[PDB]
Design a protein around this ligand. Structure first.
Ligand code: CA
Ligand code: CA
Ligand code: CA
Ligand code: CA
Lengths: 1173, 55
């Protein structure tokens, strides 16, 4: 009883943690990142200044913490994962197989994110001897990591260090050299606060820094040392230990940094305050992230980069007393803070040994910087513990600094991140076959409007006029040892043109008067000679000496395929003539010719398999809608091996060997039909029969096939109304056909040159072009433009290609009333809002552009939006905006709400403010309802009409239990999403002008988005990371608190859904549900066509659950049913991991499912490409 | 019910907010505060989310 298939179009782009390590085993460094549930391994490239993704793996769990450690006498780091599985998992990366593999998995508790079950915190000893995993309260477990005789990893049983009432804010491992491992923790005990009945014992925090020493000798853990620290202390940082420095932890709290070790005195330094005019003076700041780095080739030589809540980076250093000579001692003297540079706020920062800084932004794009570092060295004031008071309560004088643009750092890459994804809509603003996905994301001045288009990114190098419309192109080498192919040839309806490498070209050889059907240089290992076949003969050209095969009959040449050692032509009579090559002379024509029942429409010879003399197979398509495979072996030349009938006449054929999903090349026959169909079949390589057919529809134009090379991979380029590239995906290893974001082409060929290699050449409508597909794998192209504030909603003009975004940054004063806000942030101010409207034009130009901004005023913030037509205005659609004044979220504070009304002017490129009408609370939901406006204010459902000076009430009622957050409607039915109590079905009674609620949700749901799929059911998501579909029972549906909605589907994507809609993503027209997630996911739910498909994907999902369990030890069925059990949804993200298995597993699953491996592959690809992309 | 019961319910809720990165990012973004700072606020709230206990 399954009916939905969940797929991921775009994986999350957030990075809650990035970590550096030699995970490949080489001395090179790599970055491991946690993106929600994806574990991703990235390779920084110091030459190109970019960072490339090595691999990604869906944990099917929640990655809460990651630690790295090295075994003694080894150069390879292992990854410890703290997740929600209740288990500790230790995994390793395998560069030979390009896959993650876990080397340990041990259960320590029950599954989930719970208070008293470790997983929240994880730290590892710097020397790799042990690690500690802990919860917020109160459990801690220490696992000892050792090396066995086999030189493999051994794990002891955990050691308990529990202590009730203890709350942990931070946890880092001490670097004690090779002494007994010690773990530091910021803790506070609530045991006293529960005992004081009135008064407290609260409003105060007794924060302690605690040391947990692990005695390897006695194999136990004890609270060795502890002391009181600043109550505002929130972060700990590891300072180098042993010989590289004195062990210890920087304790970071409100305007406080302290060294604070057990065998050292205290050393306090403040956090400088911004000195800007907009910046509030005497505003204390805290630390949000930080890095420690030890410089090579020198003892000590370590510094810190710490980040303020504004994003400002300060460099911290430690100076220790010197002896009589000029040498350091163990005693510490001072701590020095110096302003470094301002970067976006980050979850993690990473300093690479190659001199780079990787910034994992908490929101917005990620940043890759290169160090310099020029200050000027002492241009920035420096402040030390001399003599700020080690006591946190002791008075002291504030210290200020002036922020400024980048001096020590240079930005080298900005990495596209759709985090945080506030919302998206699916619409087709161009004539293109596929609708686009428009999305609003980012935060602050780094927010953005982004459009996603399904296609492959290609860069055009040259273009030129011809000017006559050419009908074909080729590129060809005169000599088989030239790395750069010499010539470029063009063909017209009555002439032929010849070009070559360089800036300009003309003619020296070849026949330029007549049309040319193909061109190839036959003789590999024989320099001299090209062939130009044309109607009425085959011209063989060799160092200027020309010898031609006559036609010679009244018949002419209608088709031809060429190979290195072989040539095949088809005449108008239907005869096929075959030419092989002797030691000298391409005229070794076969004594006999093969007659065909009808006219030949396509020919494909296939390249010469290396190590062999010739290709053994020839593909012949005819007008009788048949494709045959004829043999070319000497013993049985031109005998028919196989035959297949086709839906339409074959317009093109192409034999080609490609990498397969099972690790070895396979010989395929690509077929292009006159109806726009593309097929890929398997050529048996011996019996020559065709099996395992794949189909796709590309466009109304007849499809044509060519062989190109992209990223050192041989790919098929199919030309239809659009160009499609068929290739084997580099990471996921399946076979993909993705369209090109490029013009329609009528002909294309592989191209080479000194300037570009493995490029391509093509023609269209009086134009020739040279392009290359620089990088594949990324099937979604993204164009973006910045916005002003953090988006909130997105609405589209009902008739014109324009969007309207409402934006609101909380706790920010209006920028006014010299520092770019995207680089340094708007000036913060408590309780003040900054909000605005922006009009976005995404298609009219090459890039999306913001046409106009409408700034709000009066501490007023936009919270909702809709485009509503009003019957009273002859159906004109207006822009409805909801706002609030003096908004405080927790607790919710109502000064006043408002509804602005705007009017579309200049076809939607601008707005005219009509009137603003004040209401009690901010309206969180609008909805067009029967030619009038529906608004949700508080628990109140209200119908407004458009009046001369205000919006006018016409009906109202209380419908939801606490707060309206979404609205939708069909006919007389209104569905109301409550902030906490799920769905509420209301019905409107026209004769009575009453809004009556008649259905409500069974369980609580913290609704975040809704849509109506039909009259009876609603699909939505909630803030705990759930997607669901509820429906009205059939007995209560005829009634036009009392009745309970039925649960029709539920699923845990883990990412928080921010928007959802029903739409069509492909011309095929399968209605799908598209949704977006806060962490960047863009996902689809696809309904199954037949019960057989539902059964196949359910059983496939089961076997994938058995043979590919979640990496971190989760149970996939329990994971996808985190809060309530799974109902109705199959996880296609798991199914699509079938391609990654070893072949024995694939064959086993193929056995249980009673389908071939290639069949399973084809159905997996098919369900995705047919209904979405 | 008992002050203890409410206190546990709130502490579990704060723990869950800190535990699930998506929810934490959602709330912190709504408040326009850094995620680490919001995390610290939530963990700090665990001391006494409701009123002091009865005598
Ligand atoms: Ca093979
Ligand atoms: Ca801007
Ligand atoms: Ca009020
Ligand atoms: Ca594999």
């Amino acid at each position: 009883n399954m009916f939905l298939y969940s797929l991921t179009i775009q994986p999350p782009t957030t990075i809650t943690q990035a970590l550096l390590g030699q995970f490949s085993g080489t001395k090179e460094q790599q970055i491991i990142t946690a993106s929600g549930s994806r574990l991703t391994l990235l390779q920084p490239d110091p030459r190109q200044g970019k960072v490339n993704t090595i691999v990604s793996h869906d944990i099917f769990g929640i990655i809460r913490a990651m630690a790295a450690f090295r075994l003694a006498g080894s150069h390879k780091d292992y990854i410890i994962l703290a997740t929600d599985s209740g288990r500790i998992a230790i995994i390793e990366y395998l560069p030979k197989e390009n896959r993650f593999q876990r080397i340990h998995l041990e259960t320590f508790g029950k599954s989930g994110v719970r208070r008293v079950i470790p997983g929240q915190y994880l730290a590892a000893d710097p020397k790799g001897r042990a690690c500690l995993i802990a919860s917020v309260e109160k459990n801690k477990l220490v696992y000892v990591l050792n090396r066995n005789a086999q030189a493999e990893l051994t794990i002891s049983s955990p050691l308990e260090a529990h202590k009730p009432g203890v709350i942990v804010l931070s946890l880092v491992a001490l670097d004690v050299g090779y002494s007994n491992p010690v773990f530091a923790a910021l803790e506070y005990e609530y045991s006293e606060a529960d005992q004081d009945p009135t008064g407290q014992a609260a409003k105060q925090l007794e924060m302690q820094l605690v040391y947990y020493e692990l005695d390897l000798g006695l194999n136990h853990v004890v609270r060795k040392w502890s002391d009181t620290v600043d109550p505002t202390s929130s972060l700990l940082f590891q300072v180098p230990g042993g010989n590289d420095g004195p062990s210890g932890v920087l304790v970071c709290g409100e305007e406080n940094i302290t060294y604070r070790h057990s065998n050292q005195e205290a050393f306090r330094v403040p956090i400088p305050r911004r000195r800007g005019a907009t910046e509030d003076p005497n505003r204390k700041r805290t630390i949000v992230a930080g890095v420690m780095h030890k410089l090579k080739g020198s003892a000590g030589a370590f510094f810190f980069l710490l980040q303020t809540e504004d994003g400002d980076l300060f460099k911290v250093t430690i100076d220790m007393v010197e002896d009589e000579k000029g040498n350091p001692t163990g005693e510490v003297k001072r701590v020095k803070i110096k302003y470094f540079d301002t970067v976006p706020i980050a979850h993690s920062l990473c300093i690479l040994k190659s001199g780079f800084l990787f910034v994992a932004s908490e929101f917005g794009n990620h940043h890759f910087y290169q160090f310099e570092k020029l200050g000027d060295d002492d241009d920035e004031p420096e402040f030390t513990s001399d003599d700020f008071p080690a006591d946190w309560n002791a008075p002291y004088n504030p210290v200020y600094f002036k922020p400024r643009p980048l001096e020590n750092l240079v930005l080298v890459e900005s990495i596209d991140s759709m985090n945080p994804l506030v919302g998206c809509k699916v619409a087709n603003l161009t004539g293109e076959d596929a609708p686009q996905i428009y999305a609003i994301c980012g935060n602050g001045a780094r927010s953005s409007f982004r459009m996603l288009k399904h296609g492959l990114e290609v860069s055009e190098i040259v273009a030129s006029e011809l000017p006559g419309t050419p009908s074909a192109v080729w590129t060809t080498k005169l000599t088989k040892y030239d790395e750069y192919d010499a010539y470029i040839v063009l063909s017209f309806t009555n002439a032929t043109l010849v070009l070559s490498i360089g800036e300009t070209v003309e003619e020296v050889s070849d026949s330029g008067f007549l049309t040319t059907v193909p061109t190839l240089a036959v003789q590999q290992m024989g320099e001299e000679g090209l062939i130009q076949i044309h109607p009425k003969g085959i011209r063989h050209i060799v160092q200027g000496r020309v010898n031609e095969w006559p036609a010679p009959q009244h018949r002419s040449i209608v088709a031809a395929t060429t190979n290195e050692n072989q040539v095949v032509i088809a005449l108008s009579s239907g005869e096929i003539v075959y030419f092989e090559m002797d030691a000298d002379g391409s005229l070794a024509e076969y004594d006999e010719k093969k007659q065909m029942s009808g006219t030949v429409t396509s020919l494909s010879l296939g390249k010469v398999p290396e190590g062999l003399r010739r290709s053994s197979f020839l593909a012949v398509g005819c007008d009788d809608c048949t494709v045959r495979i004829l043999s070319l072996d000497p013993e049985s030349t031109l005998e028919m091996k196989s035959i297949q009938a086709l839906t339409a006449a074959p317009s093109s054929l192409l034999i080609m060997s490609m990498e397969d999903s099972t690790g070895g090349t396979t010989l395929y026959l690509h077929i292009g039909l006159h109806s726009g169909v593309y097929l890929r079949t398997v050529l048996d390589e011996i019996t020559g029969e065709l099996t395992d057919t794949r189909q796709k529809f590309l466009g109304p134009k007849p499809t044509k096939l060519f062989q190109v090379t992209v990223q050192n991979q041989t790919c098929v380029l199919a030309l239809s109304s659009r160009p499609w590239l068929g290739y084997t995906a580099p990471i996921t290893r399946n076979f993909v056909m993705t369209p090109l974001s490029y013009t329609e082409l009528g002909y294309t060929w592989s191209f080479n040159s000194e300037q570009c290699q493995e490029g391509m050449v093509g023609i269209h409508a009086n134009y020739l072009r040279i392009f290359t597909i620089e990088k594949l794998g990324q099937t979604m192209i993204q164009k973006s433009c910045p916005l002003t504030y953090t988006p909130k909603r997105l609405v589209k003009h009902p008739e014109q290609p324009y969007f309207y975004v409402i934006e609101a940054d909380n706790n920010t004063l209006p920028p006014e009333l010299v520092l770019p806000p995207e680089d340094f942030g708007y000036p913060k101010a408590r309780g003040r809002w900054a909000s605005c409207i922006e009009i976005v034009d995404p298609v009219s130009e090459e890039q999306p552009r913001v046409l106009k901004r409408i700034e709000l005023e009066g501490n007023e913030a936009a919270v909702s939006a809709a485009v509503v037509p009003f019957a009273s205005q002859d159906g004109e659609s207006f822009l409805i905006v909801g706002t609030g004044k003096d908004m405080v979220l927790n607790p919710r504070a109502s000064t006043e709400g408002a509804i602005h009304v705007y009017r579309f002017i200049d076809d939607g490129r601008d707005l005219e403010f009509i009137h603003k009408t004040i209401i009690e609370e901010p309206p969180l939901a609008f909805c067009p309802f029967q030619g009038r406006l529906l608004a949700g204010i508080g628990k109140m459902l209200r119908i407004y009409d458009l009046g001369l000076k205000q919006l006018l009430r016409k009906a109202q009622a209380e419908v939801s239990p606490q707060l309206i957050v979404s609205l939708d409607t069909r006919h007389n039915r209104i569905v109301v999403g409550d902030v906490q109590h799920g769905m509420t079905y209301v019905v409107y009674k026209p004769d009575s002008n009453k809004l009556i609620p008649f259905a409500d949700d069974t369980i609580a749901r913290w609704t975040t988005c809704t849509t109506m799929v039909d009259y009876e059911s609603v699909a939505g998501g909630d803030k705990f990371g759930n997607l669901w579909i509820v429906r009205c029972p059939e007995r209560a549906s005829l009634e036009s608190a009392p009745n309970r909605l039925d649960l029709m589907a539920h699923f845990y994507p883990q990412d928080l859904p921010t928007s959802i809609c029903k739409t069509n993503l492909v011309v095929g027209g399968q209605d799908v549900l598209v949704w977006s997630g806060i962490q960047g996911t863009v996902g689809v739910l696809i309904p199954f066509v037949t019960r057989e498909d539902a059964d196949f994907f359910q059983n496939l999902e089961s076997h994938m659950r058995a043979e590919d369990p979640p990496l971190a030890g989760r149970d996939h069925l329990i994971y996808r049913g985190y809060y309530v059990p799974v109902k109705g949804v199959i996880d296609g993200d798991l199914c699509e991991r079938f391609t990654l298995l070893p072949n024995d597993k694939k064959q086993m699953i193929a056995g249980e499912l009673d389908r071939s491996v290639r069949e399973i592959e084809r159905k997996i690809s098919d369900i995705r490409t047919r209904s979405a992309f | 019910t008992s002050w203890e019961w409410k206190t546990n319910i709130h502490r579990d809720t704060y723990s869950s907010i800190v535990g699930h990165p998506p929810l934490l990012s959602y709330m912190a973004l709504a408040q326009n505060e850094p995620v680490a700072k919001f995390r610290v606020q939530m963990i700090r709230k665990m001391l006494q989310p409701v009123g002091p206990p009865p005598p």
